[PDB]
Amino acid sequence: HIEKLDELRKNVSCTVIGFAEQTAELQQEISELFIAEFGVNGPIDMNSLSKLARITSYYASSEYFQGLAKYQRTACKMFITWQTLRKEAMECRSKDREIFASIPAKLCFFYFYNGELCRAVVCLLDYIDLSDDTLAKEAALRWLMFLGETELIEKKLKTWKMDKSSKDMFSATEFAMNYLKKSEYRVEMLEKLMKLRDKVKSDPTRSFSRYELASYVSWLCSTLSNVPVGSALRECEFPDRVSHIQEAALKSDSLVRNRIPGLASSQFDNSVNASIWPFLDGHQEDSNYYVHIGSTIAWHFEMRRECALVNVTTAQTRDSMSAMILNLRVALKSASFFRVLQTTNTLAYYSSIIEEAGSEKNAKLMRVSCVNLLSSNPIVCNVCTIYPLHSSFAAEYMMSYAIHSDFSQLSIKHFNDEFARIRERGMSSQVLMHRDSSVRPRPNIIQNEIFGMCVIRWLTKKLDSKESADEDTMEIFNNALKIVRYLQQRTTDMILAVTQLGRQLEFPMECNYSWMRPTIDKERFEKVRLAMRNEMNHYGHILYREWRCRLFAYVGRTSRDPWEAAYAWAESTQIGARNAVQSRLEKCKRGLVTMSGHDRFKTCVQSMPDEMTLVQIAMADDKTIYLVKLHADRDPIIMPLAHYSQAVELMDKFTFLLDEDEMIAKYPGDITPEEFWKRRKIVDGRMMTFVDEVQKHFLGVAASLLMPSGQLGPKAAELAIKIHKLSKGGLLLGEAKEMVYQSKLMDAKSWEALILRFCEMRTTDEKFKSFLPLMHRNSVEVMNQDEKKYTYLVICPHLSQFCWERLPIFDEYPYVGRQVSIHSTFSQLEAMKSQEKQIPLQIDVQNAYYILDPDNNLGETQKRMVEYINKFNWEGTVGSAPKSNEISAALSQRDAFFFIGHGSGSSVMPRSVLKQSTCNAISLLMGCGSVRTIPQALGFDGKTAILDYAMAKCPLIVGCLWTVTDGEIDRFLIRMIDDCFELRQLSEAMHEARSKARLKYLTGAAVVMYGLPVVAKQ
Amino acid sequence: LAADIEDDMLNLEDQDVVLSEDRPYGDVIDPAESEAEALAELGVEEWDSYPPIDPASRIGDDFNYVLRTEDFAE
C-alpha cells in the first residue's frame, strides 16, 4: 500500500515545509522589529512590555499571519488521512518503513512547534510504534508523563527497549509514575528521584540526551511536593517546586541554544536568526531530526510557561514578571499563533491577578492586545480554523474571552459549558493515543490549568463582591471541582485553592459587629472545619499564594481558641518572601519555613523576649482587617478592626493626601519659597487631624491595645483570672490578662467599651455589665503596686504605606518600630540567639560603610551629608557604585550601612548582590519610598525592596515611606545619628528628630524602622 | 518663617517598575554534542521547491473546520 503513502509523504512534507517556511517568514518579520523596538543587543525590563504590545500588533497585522491558517487545516487532514492509512504503514514490514518514518515525524515537527500537544504526542507515539527511534522515545516518554497519562505509560514502558543510555531515563519516569499511584511508595521513590536529581547535576558530560533528561528529571521532582504529607512524610523532606523549575527551564533552555540559538529564553542578543528553516546544515530529508527539533522547542515553551505559571501562584511577583515577558518574546521569535497566545493571555491574566501595582496601565495595554491578536484586521477566518481542531487553543480563546469580559459570572458559564464541548470535540485525538476505546481520557493538562486559572480568578471576584446566592454558582463550581481533580498531583495549586474558594463561598462568616461599620447550620459549619484542621495539618509545606492566604486567614477568622488563630494568621502572610527563602534552601519541608503546627508556634512566642510584643494587623480571606497581638505572657489577642471598604476609604484619602506631597515636590514650578512651606503645612496639619480620625474612626477604642504588653505582676495576675472567671466565658484569660495591664493607660469609658467589645463575639453577659466599672477601679489598685519595651508592627501591605507608628497613642510613646513578617522576626530572633547578640544591637558606627549619591546627579545633598561624614571616619565611595563585590564585602564586614542616594538598591545594590551574601549590617536606606511597599493584591505581600533584605537576614532597615524632600530627609539623618552618640536608642532617636523636623507628620513620619532596635555601642 | 524650597531625591526604579534583567538565566558556553544512536542514511529524490511546494498545497483545501468530525469516524 505504497501507492498512496508515497503520495501522502510527499503531501505531508510539502505541508510541513510549506508551514516551516511560512512561519520562517513571520519570525524574520519580527526580526525586523526586535532591532527597531529593542536593539541588536538592547536591554529588556518590566517596562519593555509596552514595547512587546507593539510587536504582537505588527505580528498579527503582517500579511503572513493569516496565511498559516491554511497550513493548519491541511496538516489536520494529513493527520486524519494518516490514521486511516496507519494500519497499512505498520504492515509494510520492510526497510521502506524508514522512508515512511518521515510521515508522522514531519507532523511531529508540526504539532509540537504549533503546540497542538494532544495531536503532537500521538503521531510521535505512532512514530515510536512505527520506527522505534532511540532518541525519539526519549522525547515520547517526557510528553506522556507531561500530560499526566498514568495508565498509558504503564503499557508502553514494558514493550520498548531500554538501552544503556535509555535505562537511566526510563527509570526516571518509573520512579515518578509509581510515586503518584501508590501512597506507600511516596517515601521510597522520592529518594530514588532525589538521588537521580543530584546524579545528573553531578555528571559533567555535555551530552544532548543527558541535558534532555537534566531538564525532565528536574521537572519530575518539581511537582513532587504536591502530595498530602502524613506521618510517614513529615520526617522526609521534599524538593521545592519553585527552585528547580527555574533549573528545569534552564536545562531545557540550554537544549535550544545547541539546536536553534534564537528560541532560547536566556538569549537577549536577538541578532541571531531563530530560523527553523535551514535545520542546521542539512536534515531536510532526515526523519528523526524533526521530532528532535520539534519536541525540544515544544519542551522549552512547556517549561517556560510552567515556570511562569508556577510563579503567578507562589507569589513570586519578581520572578514571574520577568519570566512572563521573556516567555512572550521567545514566543514571538517562534511566531507560533498558539505559543504567543498562551503567553499573551497570561500577561493579561497576571495583570488582572496583581492590582494597584501601577499595572492598571499594564493590563489595559495587554488585555486589549490578546483581543487584538484574536480578531481580524488588527490595530473568525484565522482563529476559527484552529479553534475546533486544537484542544489546548480552544481553552486559550475562551480564556481570552474571560479576560476581555473581566471574569463575569456568565462568562464562566460560557466557559463551563464550552469546556464540555472541547473535551468532547478533542476526545478523538486523545483516544487514538491510547488505542483503546475502553479507557476514558482526562482533559488536556494545559486545558485543566487554563480552566483552573479561570474559575479561581472568578471565585475571588465573588468573594470581593460577597455573594453566593444562585444555585448555578454551585453547579458551575461542582463542575469546576471535578475538572481539576483528574490529577491529584501536578495541579494542586488549582485543586486546593478552588476548594477553599468554594468552601468560603458557602460559608462567608462576614461577622457583622457593632464596631465594623461598612461604608459604601452549626453542623454545616463543622463539616468543613474538620477538613480545614486536616488541610492545615496536611499540605503544610505548600506555600501557594491563592490557597494559603484564603485558608489560613479563614481558619484564623473562625477558630474558637486563640492559639490556633495566631499560627493561622502568621503563616498566611508574606508568601513571596518565604518562597525565595525556600528556593534558597532548595529543599522544602514541614517545619523549616512554615511552623510545625501550633505546638511549635507557641514555643517560640514564649521564647520571644518579654519586652518584644508584635501587634500584627492582617487582612483576612474575606477582605477585612483583623488585629493579632502576640506576646509571651498572654494568649494572642485577635479582634476585627474594620472592613476593606473602611480601609479603602482610609488608603484612598491618605494617598490622595500623599499625592499632594508628591505633586508639590515633583512640580513646584515657580512657587515663592514661603507658600511652598505654607500650603503643605496645613496638609501636614491635616495629618495632625487625620491620624486622630484614624484613631477614632478606623481603629476606634482598639487603638489603645497597640501599646506594648509587659509581664503582669503576680499579685495583679489574681485579678486577671477573676476578670476571666466573672466574665462567664465572654473573655478568655490571655485576652483579659492584658486588659488589666492596659487599664492604667486608657480611659474609663474606653476600657469599659473594649472589654465589652470582646464580649460582642462570644456570649455577652448582662450581669457582668452592671459590675463592670468596679473591675477598672480594682485594676488601678493592683497595677501601681505591682525597661524599653517595644510594639512591633507587622502591617498587611495594603496598609503598610500609612505611618502606623505615628498615632495619638504613640505621641508620648516612641518605641514603636515596625516589622515585615512574624516568621521573619523569629528567624531574625534566632539569628540573634545563634550569634548571642544583645536584643538591641550594639553598633560601632565609626567603621560603618556608606553609599552616597551615585552617578553625581544628586547635587548639594552629596556635599551636605559628606560634611557629616567629615566628622566621622566612615569608608565608602562617592558619586559611583564601586563594584557589587565590595557591596557584599560591605554588608558582611562593616557593622552598619548608610544609603543616601537615589531610591533604594537600584544600581548600587540590586537583587543580585543581596542573594550572594548575608548581612549583619544594619542598613539605613534614604530616598523617597525606600521601604514603600506598593500594595499588590491579597497574598502577594506588596512590591518592594524590603523582601530582599528580609531574605538576606539584615537586622534592621531604616527606610522612608513616600516621596520626601531631599533636604529635610538629610536634615533628618544628621539629627538622628548625632542623637545616637551625642541609652537613647534609634526609635528614640527618630522621635527626637521629630522635635527637630520642620514638618510633623508629612515628613517626619516617613521614616519607619524594620527590625531589631539599634543601641549605640560605647 | 521658612527655609528655602527643596528638591526631592526621587527614584527612577520606582521599586521594580524597571528591572533590566541580565542574560545569566542560564549557564554560558554550553555547546553540546548530539550523541545520537540512529543516524541512518536518507534517500535522494527530486525536491518540490518553494514554487513547487505551494502547488501540492493548492490541491488540498482540506475541509472547513469539519476535519474533527471526520476524526471519530475511524
* Domain regions of chain A by residue span: 2-386, 641-790, 797-1016
In B, which residues are within 8 Å of A268 by CB distance? 23
Beta bridge partners of B33: A207
Close Cβ partners of A851 (under 8 Å, ≥ 6 residues apart): A876, A877, A881, A887, A897, A898, A899, A900, A901, A908, A909
DSSP class of A698: I
- Please check whether residue A715 is in contact with residue A781, taking contact to mean a CB–CB distance below 8 angstroms: no
Least Cα separation, residue B46 to chain A (angstroms): 11
The DSSP annotation for B1-39 comes to --PPP--B---SSTTTT-----S-SS-SS---B---S--
Phi and psi angles of residue A323, each rounded to the nearest 5 degrees, phi first:
-80, -5
Cβ of B33 within 8 Å of Cβ of A206? The answer is: yes
Nearest by CB: B40 against A78, A98, A267: A98
Q: In terms of residues, how long is chain B?
A: 74
d(CA A922, CA A958): 8
Query: Strands A956-958 and A1009-1011: what pairing?
Result: antiparallel
Residue A490: name the closest of A892, A141, A149, A11 by CA: A149
Report the b/e string of A863-886 with b at 16+ CB within 10 A. ebbeebbeeeebebbbeebeebee
Distance CA A942, CA A953 (A): 19
Contact in structure between A498 and A492 (CB atoms under 8 Å): no
**Which of chain B's residues have a Cβ under 8 Å away from the Cβ of A267?**
23
Task: Classify strands A637-643 and A624-630 as parallel, antiparallel or unpaired.
Answer: antiparallel
Interface test mutation site (partner B, options A203, A206, A287, max chain B beta carbons within 10 A): A206
Alpha-carbon distance values, A803 to A111, A615, A658, A838, B9 (Å)? 56, 14, 11, 28, 20
Partner-chain residue, chosen from B3, B19, B31, that has the shortest CB–CB distance to A322: B19
User: Which grid coordinates belong to A69?
Assistant: 491558517
Q: Where are the beta strands (DSSP E) in A811-900?
A: 841-843, 849-852, 875-878, 896-899
Position A56, amino acid: T
Q: Considering CB atoms only, which of A257, A429, A900 is closest to B71?
A: A429
List of E strands, A500-596: none
Report the residue of A4, A10, A45 to disrupt the B interface, i.e. the one with the largest count of B CBs within 10 Å: A45
List of residues 6+ apart from A332 with CB closer than 8 A = A30, A34, A52, A55, A56, A59, A340
**B contact test, residue of A71, A95, A135 with most B CBs within 10 A:** A135
Contacts with A799 (C-beta within 8 Å, 6 or more apart), sequence order: A617, A625, A647, A650, A651, A935
Alpha carbon separation from A226 to A172, A573, A590, A595 (Å, rounded): 18, 20, 12, 18
| C-alpha distance from B59 to closest chain A C-alpha (Å) | 10
- Sheet holding A922-925: strands in order across? A875-878, A849-852, A896-899, A922-925, A956-958, A1009-1011
Cβ atoms A379, A432 nearer than 8 A: no
A285–B8 C-beta distance less than 8 A:
no
- Cα torsion through A211, A214, A216, A221, rounded to 10: -170
* Three-state DSSP class for residue A85: coil
CB A900 within 8 A of CB A861: yes
B63 is a domain residue: yes
In-domain check, residue B62? yes
Question: Is the CB of residue B58 less than 8 Å away from at least one CB of chain A?
Answer: no
Please tell me whether residue A112 adopts helix, strand or coil conformation. helix
What is the C-alpha separation between A219 and A241, in angstroms, rounded?
9
One-letter amino acid at A387 equals Y
Instruction: For chains A and B, count residue pairs whose Cβ atoms are closer than 8 Å.
Output: 227
Task: Confirm or reject contact between B20 and chain A (CB < 8 A).
Answer: yes
Whether residues A77 and B19 touch (CB distance < 8 A) is answered with no
C-beta of residue A789 within 8 angstroms of C-beta of residue A611: yes
As given in the structure block, the three cell numbers for residue A362 are 499594564
Within 10 angstroms of residue A54's Cβ, the number of other Cβ atoms is 14
Order of strands, edge to edge, in the sheet holding A637-643? Answer: A637-643, A624-630, A612-619, A790-794
Structural contact between residues A489 and A227, judged by C-beta atoms closer than 8 angstroms: yes
Q: Find, among A166, A13, A169, A15, the residue nearest to A101 by Cα.
A: A13
d(CA A1000, CA A871): 28
Q: Do A906 and B67 touch (CB under 8 A)?
A: no
3-state secondary structure of A762: coil
- Chain A hits for B11, Cβ within 8 Å: 902-904, 906, 927-930
Could you tell me the end-to-end alpha-carbon distance of chain B, in angstroms, rounded to an integer? 92
Whether residue B19 lies inside any domain: the answer is no
Based on the residue annotation, tell me whether A511 is a catalytic residue of this protein.
Answer: no
Q: Judge whether B74 is closer than 8 Å to chain A, CB to CB.
A: yes
| Chain length of chain A | 1018
How many domains does chain B divide into?
A: 1
User: Closest Cα to residue A805, out of A794, A797, A701, A940?
Assistant: A794
Q: Residues A640, A618: contact at Cβ < 8 Å? A: no
Burial A336-358 (b: 16+ CB within 10 A, else e): bbbbbbbbbbbbbbbbbbbeebe
CA distance A763 to A250: 58
Q: Is B29 on the interface with A (CB under 8 A)?
A: no
| DSSP state letters, A618-677 | EE-SSSEEEEEEE-SSSPPEEEEEEEHHHHHHHHHHHHHHHHHHHHHHH--TT--HHHHH
One-letter amino acid at A117 equals: L
Which residue range(s) make up the domain with B72?
45-74
Count CB neighbours of A445 within 10 A. 20
Task: Give the integer Cα–Cα distance in Å for A336 and A68.
Answer: 9
> Could you count the other beta carbons within 10 Å of the beta carbon of residue A600?
13
Of A361, A249, A368, the closest CA to residue A301 belongs to A249
Please give the helix or strand (H or E) that residue A924 lies within, else none.
Answer: strand A922-925
Alpha carbons A694 and A803: distance in angstroms, whole number = 11
Q: Would you call A963 helix, strand, or coil by DSSP?
A: coil
Chain A contacts of B18, Cβ < 8 Å? 45-47
Yes or no, beta carbons of A389 and B11 under 8 Å apart: no
Residue A837 exposed, middle or buried by CB count within 10 Å (0-12, 13-18, 19+): middle
Judging by beta carbons within 10 Å of its beta carbon (0-12, 13-18, 19+), is residue A765 exposed, middle or buried? middle
Cα distance between residue A480 and residue A493, in whole Å: 14
B51 domain-assigned? yes
The span from the CA of A50 to the CA of A872, in Å, is: 47
Nearest to A400 by CA among A388, A387, A389: A387
Q: Tell me how far apart the alpha carbons of residues A959 and A66 are, in angstroms, rounded to a whole number.
A: 54
Q: Which of A76, A928, A954, A960 is catalytic?
A: A928
The reply to whether B1 falls in a domain is no
| Amino acid (1-letter code) at residue A430 | Q
Helix or strand holding residue A513 (H, E): none
Q: Count the alpha carbons within 13 Å of A933 in the hemisphere toward its beta carbon.
A: 27
Nearest to A176 by CA among A141, A138, A203, A211: A141
Kindly give the pairing relationship between strand A1014-1016 and strand A1009-1011: unpaired
Whether A797 and chain B come into contact, CB under 8 Å, resolves to: no
* CA-based nearest distance A927→chain B, Å: 6
Q: Do A98 and B68 touch (CB under 8 A)?
A: no
* Phi, psi (rounded to 5 degrees) for A64: -90, -15
Q: Is A968 on the interface with B (CB under 8 A)?
A: yes
CATH architecture for residues A797-1016:
3-Layer(aba) Sandwich (3.40)
- Alpha-carbon torsion A641, A643, A648, A650, what sign? negative
Q: For an interface test with A, which of B1, B4, B7, B8 has the most A Cβ atoms less than 10 Å from its Cβ?
A: B8
Nearest to A146 by CA among A242, A73, A228, A252: A252
Distances (CA, A) of A389 to A80, A185, A1009: 11, 39, 58
**Residue B31 forms contact with A (CB below 8 Å):** yes
Among residues A624, A594, A504, the alpha carbon closest in space to that of A555 is found at A504
Of A73, A257, A427, the CB nearest to B67: A73
Taking an 8 Å cut-off on Cβ atoms, the answer to whether B67 and A80 are in contact is: yes
**Is the CB of B57 less than 8 angstroms away from the CB of A18?**
yes
Grid cell, residue A948, equals 530582599
